[PDB]
Amino acid sequence: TLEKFVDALPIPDTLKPVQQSKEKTYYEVTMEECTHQLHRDLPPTRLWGYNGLFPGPTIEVKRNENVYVKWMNNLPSTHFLPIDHTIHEEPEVKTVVHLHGGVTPDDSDGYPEAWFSKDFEQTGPYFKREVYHYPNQQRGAILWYHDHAMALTRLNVYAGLVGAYIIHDPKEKRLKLPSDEYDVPLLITDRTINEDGSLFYPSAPENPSPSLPNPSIVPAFCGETILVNGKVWPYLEVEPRKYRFRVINASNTRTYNLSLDNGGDFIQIGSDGGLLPRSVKLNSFSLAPAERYDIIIDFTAYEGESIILANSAGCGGDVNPETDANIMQFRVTKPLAQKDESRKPKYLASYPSVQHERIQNIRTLKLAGTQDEYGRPVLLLNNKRWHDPVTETPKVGTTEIWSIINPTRGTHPIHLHLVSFRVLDRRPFDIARYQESGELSYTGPAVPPPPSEKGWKDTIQAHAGEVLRIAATFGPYSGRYVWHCHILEHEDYDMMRPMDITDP
Ligand SMILES: [Cu+2]
Ligand SMILES: [Cu+2]
Ligand SMILES: [Cu+2]
Ligand SMILES: [Cu+2]
Numbered sequence: 001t002l003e004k005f006v007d008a009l010p011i012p013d014t015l016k017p018v019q020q021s022k023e024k025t026y027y028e029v030t031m032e033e034c035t036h037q038l039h040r041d042l043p044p045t046r047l048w049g050y051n052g053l054f055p056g057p058t059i060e061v062k063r064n065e066n067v068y069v070k071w072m073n074n075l076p077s078t079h080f081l082p083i084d085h086t087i088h089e090e091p092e093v094k095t096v097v098h099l100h101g102g103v104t105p106d107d108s109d110g111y112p113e114a115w116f117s118k119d120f121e122q123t124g125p126y127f128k129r130e131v132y133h134y135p136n137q138q139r140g141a142i143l144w145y146h147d148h149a150m151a152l153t154r155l156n157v158y159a160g161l162v163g164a165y166i167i168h169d170p171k172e173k174r175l176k177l178p179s180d181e182y183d184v185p186l187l188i189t190d191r192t193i194n195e196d197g198s199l200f201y202p203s204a205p206e207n208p209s210p211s212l213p214n215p216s217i218v219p220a221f222c223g224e225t226i227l228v229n230g231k232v233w234p235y236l237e238v239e240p241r242k243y244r245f246r247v248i249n250a251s252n253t254r255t256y257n258l259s260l261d262n263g264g265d266f267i268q269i270g271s272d273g274g275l276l277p278r279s280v281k282l283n284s285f286s287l288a289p290a291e292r293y294d295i296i297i298d299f300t301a302y303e304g305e306s307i308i309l310a311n312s313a314g315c316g317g318d319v320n321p322e323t324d325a326n327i328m329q330f331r332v333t334k335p336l337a338q339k340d341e342s343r344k345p346k347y348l349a350s351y352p353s354v355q356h357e358r359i360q361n362i363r364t365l366k367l368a369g370t371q372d373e374y375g376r377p378v379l380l381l382n383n384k385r386w387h388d389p390v391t392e393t394p395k396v397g398t399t400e401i402w403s404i405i406n407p408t409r410g411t412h413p414i415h416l417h418l419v420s421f422r423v424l425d426r427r428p429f430d431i432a433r434y435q436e437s438g439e440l441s442y443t444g445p446a447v448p449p450p451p452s453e454k455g456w457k458d459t460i461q462a463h464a465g466e467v468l469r470i471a472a473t474f475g476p477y478s479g480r481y482v483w484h485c486h487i488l489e490h491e492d493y494d495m496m497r498p499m500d501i502t503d504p
Contacts (some may be wrong), residue, residue, distance in 0.1 A: 001224075002042070002193075002225060002233065004326055004329070005233055005234065005235040005306075005328075005329040006040045006233075006235075007039060007040050007232065007233075008234060008235060008236070008237070009229055009234040009236040010230055010231055010234075011184060012053065012056070012163070012229060013057055013058070014057065014058050015027055015029070015057035015058065015059050015060075023066060024066045024067075024068060025068065026067075026069075026070075027059065027068065028069070028070045028072065029050050029051055029056070029057070029071050029072065030052075030072040031071070031072065031073050031095060032048070032049060032051070032052035032074050033046065033075055033076050034046075034048075034052040034054075036049075036230065037197075038193060038197070038227065038231060038232050039231065039232035039233075042193065044197060045197045046080060046198060047159060047199070048156065048159035048160045049160050050145075050163050053163075053230075054160040054162075055160070055187045055189075055229060055250070056145065056161070056162065056164075057163060058163065058164045058165070058166065058185055060168065061134070061136050061165070061166070061167055062168050062170065063136055063137070063139075063170065064136060064137055065136050066133075066135060066136075067133075067135075068132065068133055068134070069097075069131070069134065070132070071095075071096075071097040073093070073095045073117060073119070074118060075095065075118060077091065077092065077093055079152075080199075081199070081201045082201060082203040082215035083152070083215065084217045086213045086216070086217075086374070087151055087217050087492060087493045087494070090122070091121075091122050093117060094117060094149040094152055095115060095116060095117075095147055095149050095161075096110045096111070096112065096147065096149050097110050097132065097146070097147065097148070098110030098146060098147070098148035098417075099134060100146060100415075100458075101141060101142075101144070101272060101273070101420070102134055102138075102165075102418075103135070103136070103137055103476070103477075104132075104133075104134055104135075104418065105133060105479065106479030106480050106481060107479075108129065109417060109418070110132075111126045111148075111482065112124075112150040112151075112153070112482065113126040114127045114128065115149040115150060116130075124150065126480070136167055137476070138167065138274075139167070139169065139273060139274035139456065140167050140168055140274055141166075141270065141272070141274040141292075141294075142165075142166060142185070142246040142248065142270065142292045142294055143164075143167060144162065144292070145162070145164075145165050146161055146163070147161040151492055153488050153491055153492055154221070154252055154489050154492050155201065157252065158201055158221075158252055159199070160230075162250040164187060164248060166185070169274075175343065176341065176342055176343040176345075177244055177269065177296070177342060177343065178241075178242045178243055178296060179244070181337070182239075182241070182242065182243050182342065183244045183246070184236075184244070184246070185229070185245075185246040185248065186229065186328075187228065187248045188226065188227070188228055188249055188250060188256065188327065189223075189226075189227045189230075189250045190223030190224075190225065190227070190251045191223045191224075191225050191227055192223045192224045192225065193224070193232075201221070202221065203215040203216070204218070209375055211374050211375050212374050212375070212376065213374060216376065217489065219377050220315075220316065220487065220489050221252045221253045221488075221489055222315035222317075222324075223251070223254065223315075224323060225323065225324075226311070226326065226327050228328045233326055233328065235328065235330070236330055237331045237333055238299050238331065238332050238333075238334055239299070239334045239336050239337065239340075240299050240301075240332050240336065241298075241299060241342070242296055242297070242298045242300065242340055242343075242344060243296065243297055243299065244294070244295070245293075245294075245295050245297060246294055247292060247295060248292050249287045249288060249289050249291050249292075250290075252488040253315065253488065254289070254313075255287065255289070255313050255411065255461075256287045256311050256313055256327070257284060257285070257286050257287070257312045258284060258287060258327065259309075259310050259312065260309065260310070261308040262302065262305060263283070264297070264298075264302065264307065265281050265282060265283055266281075266282045266283075266285065266293075266296070266297060267279050267295060267296040267297075267298070267344050268280040268281075268285070268293055268452055269296055269348055270293070270294025270348075271294070271457055272291060272420060272457045272459055273421075273455060273456025273457055274420070274455065275294070275349040276348055276451070276452070276454065276455040277350065277454060278346055278347065278348060278454075279296075279345065279348060282295075282452070284312070286461065288411065288413035288459065289413050289487055289488070290415055290486040291413065291459050293452075296344050299332045300340070302332045303333075304332060304333065305330075305332050306331050307329065307332070308326060308330075309330070310325060310326065311325055311326065311327050352422045352455060352456060353422070357471075358398075358399065359399060359400065359471075360395060360398035360400055361394065361395075361400040362403065363392070365381060365382055365392075365402060365403065365405065366381075366383070366406075366407070367379075367381065367404065367406045367407070367414075368380055368382075368383055368407065368408070369494075369495070370383070376493075378494055379485065379493065379494065380495060381483070381485075381495055381496070381497045384497060386494050386496050386497065386498070390498045391497070392498070392499045392500070393499075393500045393501075394472075394474040394501055394502070395474070395503075395504070396474060396476075396477070396478040396503050397474070397475045397476075398473070399471060399473045399474075400471070400472055400474065401424065401470070402469070402470050402472065403467055403468075404462050404468045404470070405429070405434070405440070406463065406464055406466055406468070407429075407464075408464060410464055411462060411463050412461075412462050412490065412495070413461055413462070414462050414483070414484070415458060415460075415484055415485070415486045416458060416472065416481075416483045416499065417481040418474070418477065418481050418501070419458070419472045419473065419474060419475075420456035420458045421456070421460075422456070422457075422470065422472075423449035423453040423457060423460060423469075423470055424448075424449070424470060424471055425446040425448055425449070425468075426449075426467070426468050427442055427444065427445070427446040427466060427467050427469075428442065428465055429441060429442050429465060429467055430442075431464075440467065457470075474501045477501065478501045478502060479501055480499075481499045481500075481501060482496060482497065482499055483496075483497055483499045
């Protein structure tokens with residue numbers, strides 16, 4: 001396997017506007033097939049990148065900044081990863097950019113059927129605009145952007161179409177959180193890489209049934225190798241002081257459980273939807289696809305040390321000490337550029353619980369699915385296909401409780417577009433009884449969320465054999481959005497549903 005910790009961690013450059021005034025900011029981003037070295041000992045890898053970069057450029061905006069991005073497809077007309085056409089004259093390569101966590105008008109949200117081919121030559125049925133509009137009228141937070149094209153999301157994202165997007169709220173500057181050079185995004189992506197440096201993505205399940213098509217979708221993908229910011233098991237030289245890290249799980253399937261091998265602590269300051277009400281001291285944390293942890297690590301007491309960011313969560317088996325048990329390495333050997341004037345405050349933001357909202361609707365949803373003509377699992381939300389008439393139709397400005405029942409064998413990270421939400425509780429139930437009769441019989445009391453989940457979330461782990469309850473206010477915009485599992489192999493077949501936020 002590839003030698004760990006021999007490449008420095010890339011810090012994606014911050015994207016510069018094409019045009020900017022007090023009234024609006026304008027960016028242009030072009031998807032390009034490019035080559036990049038993923039490790040010291042590998043030949044360059046063919047990848048798909050925003051502005052030809054993997055990851056894409058980091059976009060930094062202010063709260064309420066009127067931002068426009070023209071996302072353009074200049075990719076080849078044929079994919080380099082295996083497409084399974086059985087899961088859905090249309091072009092082979094379809095793309096659309098979704099700003100994950102964006103409080104965004106529906107035609108700028110990157111609807112899966114709002115895709116476009118090269119030069120916008122062909123467009124999906126929901127396509128409306130070339131230039132996307134992000135008003136950014138939302139809390140300061142770590143967002144990320146990635147491809148969302150119908151039935152191709154697992155492939156386009158794996159190809160390299162991911163990037164970070166940070167909203168800065170000037171009202172939070174007074175907290176004196178680590179900033180600028182000491183505010184670093186970490187986009188974590190697992191990959192399998194061939195000897196010749198080319199990306200590997202499976203064209204079928206291992207030793208497939210002859211009934212299965214070729215290529216065939218797989219229900220999950222676990223990469224052999226871990227990358228951070230487009231480099232295999234990198235090192236980051238750090239100064240002996242406080243750093244803020246924007247930790248993003250940009251992987252297809254893999255969930256991480258992160259810790260420091262010297263026994264050091266993380267201080268979590270934020271979740272998907274922004275700053276937590278109170279900072280939380282953690283020795284470890286779980287991070288499923290699309291979840292974000294905004295953390296401070298204090299290296300002040302660790303000068304000279306090499307500290308591994310370690311992973312204990314298995315993917316299709318136990319972690320391998322020499323491979324996927326490792327994420328990256330910090331080396332506390334960089335000379336101080338300046339006095340550490342940053343803070344790790346306890347009091348950060350308003351509790352979500354301050355705002356009282358009337359519960360307009362309680363929505364019960366089950367995670368299940370079926371089997372197709374080839375014998376493959378088809379994962380479904382409420383046993384409905386993507387193309388079935390819309391059923392999730394919250395009214396604009398109203399608050400709902402969603403009760404998500406998971407009788408399956410694994411965790412699903414459930415994501416809702418547009419909104420961030422509060423976690424209410426999790427409660428275990430009798431799976432066998434539910435699958436037989438449809439009746440919920442609880443096997444224990446409800447468990448309130450841990451401090452890490454007392455803030456705002458947009459992607460939430462729904463564990464096996466539990467009912468998860470969340471509360472969301474559906475606004476400020478009305479329109480056509482989506483909700484889905486963010487395991488991309490599940491999302492594409494077919495664990496995704498439209499979500500209509502309706503106006504009277
Ligand atoms: Cu996403
Ligand atoms: Cu999203
Ligand atoms: Cu899933
Ligand atoms: Cu989505």
